């Protein structure tokens, strides 16, 4: 009876630590998404973007060097869903 909600959220820095690049799995039923952020694990979260219609978002507002935590929700025929499971901001994996 709950509408479906975003899952699989990943929040990855670019290699300069300047931006946070989010990606998540689409929520069946969604028209758009809300991106939310906290400086501490578990929130409360602060909304940073609304009316996002793709399954990705770049958060350019992070302080370089600071840990952040994110969740994303969907808005589905005007009804906001649960927030996703939390993603911990991380640098990308170094390859090879």
CSV table of N, CA, C and O in Angstrom, one decimal:
chain,number,residue,atom,x,y,z
A,1,UNK,N,0.8,-1.3,0.0
A,1,UNK,CA,0.0,0.0,0.0
A,1,UNK,C,0.8,1.3,0.0
A,1,UNK,O,0.4,2.3,-0.5
A,2,UNK,N,2.0,1.2,0.6
A,2,UNK,CA,3.0,2.3,0.4
A,2,UNK,C,3.3,2.3,-1.1
A,2,UNK,O,3.5,1.3,-1.8
A,3,UNK,N,3.4,3.6,-1.7
A,3,UNK,CA,4.0,3.7,-3.0
A,3,UNK,C,5.5,3.3,-3.0
A,3,UNK,O,6.1,3.3,-2.0
A,4,UNK,N,5.9,2.9,-4.2
A,4,UNK,CA,7.3,2.5,-4.3
A,4,UNK,C,8.2,3.7,-4.1
A,4,UNK,O,7.9,4.7,-4.5
A,5,UNK,N,9.4,3.5,-3.6
A,5,UNK,CA,10.4,4.5,-3.2
A,5,UNK,C,11.7,4.2,-3.8
A,5,UNK,O,12.0,3.1,-4.2
A,6,UNK,N,12.5,5.3,-4.0
A,6,UNK,CA,13.8,5.0,-4.6
A,6,UNK,C,14.7,4.2,-3.7
A,6,UNK,O,14.6,4.1,-2.4
A,7,UNK,N,15.5,3.4,-4.4
A,7,UNK,CA,16.5,2.5,-3.7
A,7,UNK,C,17.8,2.5,-4.4
A,7,UNK,O,18.0,3.2,-5.5
A,8,UNK,N,18.8,1.9,-3.9
A,8,UNK,CA,20.1,1.8,-4.4
A,8,UNK,C,20.9,3.1,-4.6
A,8,UNK,O,21.6,3.3,-5.6
A,9,UNK,N,20.6,4.1,-3.7
A,9,UNK,CA,21.3,5.4,-3.8
A,9,UNK,C,22.8,5.2,-3.6
A,9,UNK,O,23.2,4.5,-2.6
A,10,UNK,N,23.6,5.9,-4.4
A,10,UNK,CA,25.0,6.0,-4.4
A,10,UNK,C,25.4,7.4,-4.5
A,10,UNK,O,24.9,8.2,-5.3
A,11,UNK,N,26.3,7.9,-3.6
A,11,UNK,CA,26.8,9.3,-3.6
A,11,UNK,C,28.3,9.3,-3.7
A,11,UNK,O,29.0,8.9,-2.8
A,12,UNK,N,28.8,9.7,-4.8
A,12,UNK,CA,30.3,9.6,-5.1
A,12,UNK,C,30.8,10.9,-5.4
A,12,UNK,O,30.3,11.6,-6.4
A,13,UNK,N,31.9,11.3,-4.8
A,13,UNK,CA,32.7,12.5,-5.2
A,13,UNK,C,33.3,12.4,-6.5
A,13,UNK,O,33.7,11.3,-6.9
A,14,UNK,N,33.5,13.5,-7.2
A,14,UNK,CA,34.5,13.6,-8.3
A,14,UNK,C,35.9,13.5,-7.7
A,14,UNK,O,36.1,13.5,-6.4
A,15,UNK,N,36.9,13.4,-8.5
A,15,UNK,CA,38.2,13.1,-8.1
A,15,UNK,C,38.9,14.3,-7.4
A,15,UNK,O,39.9,14.1,-6.6
A,16,UNK,N,38.3,15.5,-7.6
A,16,UNK,CA,38.8,16.6,-6.8
A,16,UNK,C,38.0,16.9,-5.5
A,16,UNK,O,38.3,17.8,-4.8
A,17,UNK,N,37.0,16.0,-5.2
A,17,UNK,CA,36.3,16.3,-4.0
A,17,UNK,C,35.3,17.5,-4.1
A,17,UNK,O,34.9,18.0,-3.0
A,18,UNK,N,35.1,17.9,-5.3
A,18,UNK,CA,34.3,19.2,-5.4
A,18,UNK,C,32.8,19.0,-5.5
A,18,UNK,O,32.1,19.9,-5.1
A,19,UNK,N,32.4,17.9,-6.2
A,19,UNK,CA,30.9,17.7,-6.3
A,19,UNK,C,30.6,16.3,-5.9
A,19,UNK,O,31.4,15.4,-6.0
A,20,UNK,N,29.3,16.1,-5.5
A,20,UNK,CA,28.7,14.8,-5.1
A,20,UNK,C,27.8,14.3,-6.2
A,20,UNK,O,26.8,15.1,-6.5
A,21,UNK,N,28.1,13.2,-6.8
A,21,UNK,CA,27.4,12.7,-7.9
A,21,UNK,C,26.5,11.5,-7.4
A,21,UNK,O,27.0,10.5,-7.0
A,22,UNK,N,25.2,11.8,-7.4
A,22,UNK,CA,24.2,10.8,-6.9
A,22,UNK,C,23.5,10.0,-8.1
A,22,UNK,O,23.2,10.7,-9.1
A,23,UNK,N,23.2,8.8,-7.8
A,23,UNK,CA,22.5,8.0,-8.8
A,23,UNK,C,21.6,7.0,-7.9
A,23,UNK,O,22.0,6.6,-6.8
A,24,UNK,N,20.4,6.7,-8.4
A,24,UNK,CA,19.5,5.8,-7.7
A,24,UNK,C,18.7,5.1,-8.8
A,24,UNK,O,18.6,5.4,-9.9
A,25,UNK,N,18.1,4.0,-8.3
A,25,UNK,CA,17.1,3.2,-9.0
A,25,UNK,C,15.7,4.0,-9.0
A,25,UNK,O,15.3,4.4,-8.0
A,26,UNK,N,15.1,4.0,-10.2
A,26,UNK,CA,13.8,4.6,-10.4
A,26,UNK,C,12.8,4.0,-9.6
A,26,UNK,O,12.8,2.7,-9.2
A,27,UNK,N,11.8,4.8,-9.1
A,27,UNK,CA,10.6,4.3,-8.3
A,27,UNK,C,9.4,4.2,-9.2
A,27,UNK,O,9.0,5.3,-9.7
A,28,UNK,N,8.9,3.0,-9.5
A,28,UNK,CA,7.7,3.0,-10.3
A,28,UNK,C,6.7,3.9,-9.6
A,28,UNK,O,6.5,3.8,-8.3
A,29,UNK,N,5.9,4.6,-10.4
A,29,UNK,CA,5.0,5.6,-9.9
A,29,UNK,C,5.5,7.0,-9.9
A,29,UNK,O,4.7,8.0,-9.8
A,30,UNK,N,6.8,7.2,-9.9
A,30,UNK,CA,7.3,8.5,-9.7
A,30,UNK,C,7.1,9.4,-10.9
A,30,UNK,O,7.2,9.0,-12.1
A,31,UNK,N,6.9,10.7,-10.6
A,31,UNK,CA,6.9,11.9,-11.5
A,31,UNK,C,8.2,12.7,-11.3
A,31,UNK,O,8.6,13.3,-12.3
A,32,UNK,N,8.7,12.7,-10.1
A,32,UNK,CA,10.0,13.4,-9.8
A,32,UNK,C,10.5,12.9,-8.5
A,32,UNK,O,9.9,12.0,-7.9
A,33,UNK,N,11.7,13.5,-8.2
A,33,UNK,CA,12.4,13.1,-7.0
A,33,UNK,C,12.9,14.3,-6.2
A,33,UNK,O,13.1,15.4,-6.7
A,34,UNK,N,13.0,14.1,-4.9
A,34,UNK,CA,13.6,15.1,-3.9
A,34,UNK,C,14.9,14.5,-3.4
A,34,UNK,O,14.9,13.4,-2.9
A,35,UNK,N,15.9,15.3,-3.5
A,35,UNK,CA,17.3,15.0,-3.0
A,35,UNK,C,17.5,15.7,-1.6
A,35,UNK,O,17.3,16.9,-1.4
A,36,UNK,N,18.0,14.9,-0.6
A,36,UNK,CA,18.1,15.4,0.8
A,36,UNK,C,19.4,15.0,1.3
A,36,UNK,O,20.0,14.0,0.9
A,37,UNK,N,19.9,15.8,2.2
A,37,UNK,CA,21.3,15.7,2.7
A,37,UNK,C,21.4,16.0,4.2
A,37,UNK,O,20.6,16.8,4.7
A,38,UNK,N,22.4,15.4,4.9
A,38,UNK,CA,22.7,15.6,6.3
A,38,UNK,C,24.3,15.6,6.5
A,38,UNK,O,24.9,14.8,5.7
A,39,UNK,N,24.7,16.3,7.5
A,39,UNK,CA,26.1,16.1,7.9
A,39,UNK,C,26.3,15.1,8.9
A,39,UNK,O,27.5,14.7,9.2
A,40,UNK,N,25.2,14.4,9.4
A,40,UNK,CA,25.4,13.3,10.2
A,40,UNK,C,24.5,12.1,9.8
A,40,UNK,O,23.4,12.3,9.2
A,41,UNK,N,25.1,10.9,10.0
A,41,UNK,CA,24.4,9.7,9.6
A,41,UNK,C,23.0,9.7,10.3
A,41,UNK,O,23.0,9.8,11.5
A,42,UNK,N,22.0,9.4,9.5
A,42,UNK,CA,20.6,9.2,10.0
A,42,UNK,C,19.7,10.4,10.1
A,42,UNK,O,18.5,10.3,10.3
A,43,UNK,N,20.3,11.5,9.7
A,43,UNK,CA,19.5,12.8,9.6
A,43,UNK,C,19.3,13.4,11.0
A,43,UNK,O,20.1,13.1,11.9
A,44,UNK,N,18.3,14.3,11.1
A,44,UNK,CA,17.4,14.7,10.1
A,44,UNK,C,18.0,15.3,8.8
A,44,UNK,O,19.0,15.9,8.9
A,45,UNK,N,17.3,15.1,7.7
A,45,UNK,CA,17.8,15.5,6.4
A,45,UNK,C,17.2,16.9,6.0
A,45,UNK,O,16.1,17.2,6.4
A,46,UNK,N,18.1,17.6,5.3
A,46,UNK,CA,17.7,18.9,4.7
A,46,UNK,C,17.5,18.7,3.2
A,46,UNK,O,18.3,18.1,2.5
A,47,UNK,N,16.3,19.1,2.7
A,47,UNK,CA,16.1,19.0,1.2
A,47,UNK,C,17.1,20.0,0.5
A,47,UNK,O,17.2,21.1,0.9
A,48,UNK,N,17.8,19.4,-0.5
A,48,UNK,CA,18.6,20.3,-1.3
A,48,UNK,C,18.1,20.5,-2.7
A,48,UNK,O,18.5,21.4,-3.4
A,49,UNK,N,17.3,19.6,-3.3
A,49,UNK,CA,16.7,19.8,-4.6
A,49,UNK,C,15.4,19.1,-4.7
A,49,UNK,O,15.1,18.1,-4.0
A,50,UNK,N,14.4,19.7,-5.5
A,50,UNK,CA,13.1,19.2,-5.7
A,50,UNK,C,12.8,19.2,-7.2
A,50,UNK,O,13.6,19.7,-8.0
A,51,UNK,N,11.8,18.4,-7.6
A,51,UNK,CA,11.4,18.4,-9.0
A,51,UNK,C,12.5,17.9,-9.9
A,51,UNK,O,12.7,18.3,-11.1
A,52,UNK,N,13.2,16.9,-9.5
A,52,UNK,CA,14.2,16.3,-10.2
A,52,UNK,C,13.6,15.2,-11.0
A,52,UNK,O,12.9,14.3,-10.4
A,53,UNK,N,13.8,15.2,-12.3
A,53,UNK,CA,13.0,14.2,-13.1
A,53,UNK,C,13.9,13.1,-13.7
A,53,UNK,O,13.4,12.2,-14.4
A,54,UNK,N,15.2,13.2,-13.5
A,54,UNK,CA,16.1,12.0,-13.8
A,54,UNK,C,16.5,11.3,-12.5
A,54,UNK,O,16.3,11.8,-11.4
A,55,UNK,N,17.1,10.1,-12.7
A,55,UNK,CA,17.6,9.3,-11.5
A,55,UNK,C,19.0,9.6,-11.2
A,55,UNK,O,19.8,8.7,-10.8
A,56,UNK,N,19.4,10.8,-11.3
A,56,UNK,CA,20.7,11.2,-10.9
A,56,UNK,C,20.7,12.7,-10.6
A,56,UNK,O,19.8,13.5,-11.0
A,57,UNK,N,21.7,13.2,-9.8
A,57,UNK,CA,21.8,14.5,-9.4
A,57,UNK,C,23.2,14.8,-9.0
A,57,UNK,O,23.8,14.0,-8.4
A,58,UNK,N,23.7,16.0,-9.4
A,58,UNK,CA,25.0,16.5,-8.9
A,58,UNK,C,24.8,17.6,-7.8
A,58,UNK,O,24.2,18.6,-8.1
A,59,UNK,N,25.3,17.3,-6.6
A,59,UNK,CA,25.3,18.2,-5.6
A,59,UNK,C,26.6,19.1,-5.5
A,59,UNK,O,27.6,18.5,-5.1
A,60,UNK,N,26.5,20.3,-6.0
A,60,UNK,CA,27.8,21.0,-6.1
A,60,UNK,C,28.0,21.8,-4.8
A,60,UNK,O,29.1,22.5,-4.7
A,61,UNK,N,27.1,21.8,-3.8
A,61,UNK,CA,27.2,22.5,-2.6
A,61,UNK,C,27.9,21.9,-1.5
A,61,UNK,O,28.0,22.5,-0.4
A,62,UNK,N,28.6,20.8,-1.6
A,62,UNK,CA,29.3,20.2,-0.5
A,62,UNK,C,30.5,21.0,-0.2
A,62,UNK,O,31.2,21.5,-1.2
A,63,UNK,N,30.9,21.1,1.0
A,63,UNK,CA,32.2,21.6,1.4
A,63,UNK,C,33.2,20.6,1.0
A,63,UNK,O,33.1,19.4,1.5
A,64,UNK,N,34.3,21.0,0.4
A,64,UNK,CA,35.3,20.0,0.0
A,64,UNK,C,35.9,19.5,1.3
A,64,UNK,O,36.1,20.3,2.2
A,65,UNK,N,36.0,18.2,1.4
A,65,UNK,CA,36.6,17.6,2.6
A,65,UNK,C,35.7,17.1,3.7
A,65,UNK,O,36.1,16.5,4.7
A,66,UNK,N,34.4,17.3,3.5
A,66,UNK,CA,33.4,17.0,4.6
A,66,UNK,C,32.5,15.8,4.2
A,66,UNK,O,32.1,15.7,3.1
A,67,UNK,N,32.3,14.9,5.2
A,67,UNK,CA,31.4,13.8,5.0
A,67,UNK,C,29.9,14.3,5.0
A,67,UNK,O,29.5,15.2,5.7
A,68,UNK,N,29.1,13.7,4.1
A,68,UNK,CA,27.7,14.0,4.0
A,68,UNK,C,27.0,12.6,3.8
A,68,UNK,O,27.6,11.7,3.4
A,69,UNK,N,25.7,12.7,4.1
A,69,UNK,CA,24.8,11.5,4.0
A,69,UNK,C,23.6,11.9,3.2
A,69,UNK,O,23.0,13.0,3.5
A,70,UNK,N,23.1,11.1,2.3
A,70,UNK,CA,22.0,11.5,1.5
A,70,UNK,C,20.9,10.5,1.5
A,70,UNK,O,21.1,9.3,1.7
A,71,UNK,N,19.7,10.9,1.2
A,71,UNK,CA,18.6,10.1,0.9
A,71,UNK,C,17.8,10.8,-0.2
A,71,UNK,O,17.9,12.0,-0.4
A,72,UNK,N,17.0,10.0,-1.0
A,72,UNK,CA,16.2,10.5,-2.1
A,72,UNK,C,14.8,10.0,-1.9
A,72,UNK,O,14.6,8.7,-1.6
A,73,UNK,N,13.8,10.8,-2.2
A,73,UNK,CA,12.4,10.3,-2.2
A,73,UNK,C,11.8,10.6,-3.6
A,73,UNK,O,12.4,11.3,-4.4
A,74,UNK,N,10.7,10.0,-3.8
A,74,UNK,CA,9.9,10.2,-5.0
A,74,UNK,C,8.7,11.0,-4.7
A,74,UNK,O,8.3,11.0,-3.6
A,75,UNK,N,8.2,11.6,-5.7
A,75,UNK,CA,6.8,12.2,-5.6
A,75,UNK,C,6.0,11.6,-6.7
A,75,UNK,O,6.4,11.7,-7.9
A,76,UNK,N,4.9,11.0,-6.4
A,76,UNK,CA,4.2,10.0,-7.2
A,76,UNK,C,2.7,10.4,-7.2
A,76,UNK,O,2.1,10.1,-6.2
A,77,UNK,N,2.3,11.0,-8.3
A,77,UNK,CA,0.9,11.6,-8.4
A,77,UNK,C,0.7,12.5,-7.1
A,77,UNK,O,-0.3,12.4,-6.4
A,78,UNK,N,1.7,13.3,-6.9
A,78,UNK,CA,1.6,14.3,-5.8
A,78,UNK,C,1.9,13.8,-4.4
A,78,UNK,O,1.9,14.6,-3.4
A,79,UNK,N,2.1,12.5,-4.2
A,79,UNK,CA,2.3,11.9,-2.9
A,79,UNK,C,3.8,11.7,-2.8
A,79,UNK,O,4.4,10.9,-3.6
A,80,UNK,N,4.4,12.2,-1.7
A,80,UNK,CA,5.9,12.0,-1.5
A,80,UNK,C,6.0,10.7,-0.8
A,80,UNK,O,5.3,10.3,0.2
A,81,UNK,N,6.9,9.8,-1.3
A,81,UNK,CA,7.2,8.5,-0.8
A,81,UNK,C,8.2,8.5,0.4
A,81,UNK,O,8.7,9.6,0.7
A,82,UNK,N,8.4,7.4,1.0
A,82,UNK,CA,9.5,7.2,1.9
A,82,UNK,C,10.8,7.7,1.2
A,82,UNK,O,11.0,7.6,0.0
A,83,UNK,N,11.8,8.1,2.1
A,83,UNK,CA,13.1,8.3,1.6
A,83,UNK,C,13.8,6.9,1.4
A,83,UNK,O,13.6,6.0,2.3
A,84,UNK,N,14.6,6.9,0.4
A,84,UNK,CA,15.5,5.8,0.2
A,84,UNK,C,16.3,5.5,1.5
A,84,UNK,O,16.6,6.4,2.3
A,85,UNK,N,16.9,4.3,1.5
A,85,UNK,CA,18.0,4.0,2.4
A,85,UNK,C,19.1,5.1,2.2
A,85,UNK,O,19.3,5.6,1.0
A,86,UNK,N,19.9,5.4,3.2
A,86,UNK,CA,20.9,6.4,3.2
A,86,UNK,C,22.1,5.9,2.4
A,86,UNK,O,22.5,4.7,2.4
A,87,UNK,N,22.7,6.9,1.7
A,87,UNK,CA,24.0,6.7,1.0
A,87,UNK,C,25.0,7.6,1.7
A,87,UNK,O,24.7,8.8,2.0
A,88,UNK,N,26.2,7.1,2.0
A,88,UNK,CA,27.4,7.8,2.5
A,88,UNK,C,28.2,8.3,1.4
A,88,UNK,O,28.7,7.5,0.6
A,89,UNK,N,28.4,9.6,1.4
A,89,UNK,CA,29.3,10.3,0.4
A,89,UNK,C,30.7,9.6,0.6
A,89,UNK,O,31.3,9.6,1.7
A,90,UNK,N,31.2,9.3,-0.6
A,90,UNK,CA,32.6,8.7,-0.7
A,90,UNK,C,33.3,9.1,-1.9
A,90,UNK,O,32.7,9.4,-2.9
A,91,UNK,N,34.7,9.1,-1.8
A,91,UNK,CA,35.4,9.2,-3.0
A,91,UNK,C,35.3,8.0,-3.9
A,91,UNK,O,34.9,6.9,-3.5
A,92,UNK,N,35.6,8.2,-5.2
A,92,UNK,CA,35.5,7.0,-6.1
A,92,UNK,C,36.6,6.0,-5.8
A,92,UNK,O,37.7,6.3,-5.2
A,93,UNK,N,36.4,4.7,-6.1
A,93,UNK,CA,37.4,3.7,-6.0
A,93,UNK,C,38.6,3.9,-7.0
A,93,UNK,O,38.3,4.3,-8.1
A,94,UNK,N,39.8,3.7,-6.6
A,94,UNK,CA,41.0,3.9,-7.6
A,94,UNK,C,41.1,2.5,-8.2
A,94,UNK,O,41.0,1.5,-7.6
A,95,UNK,N,41.3,2.6,-9.5
A,95,UNK,CA,41.3,1.4,-10.4
A,95,UNK,C,42.6,0.6,-10.5
A,95,UNK,O,43.7,1.3,-10.4
A,96,UNK,N,42.6,-0.7,-10.7
A,96,UNK,CA,43.7,-1.5,-11.3
A,96,UNK,C,44.2,-2.5,-10.3
A,96,UNK,O,43.6,-2.7,-9.2
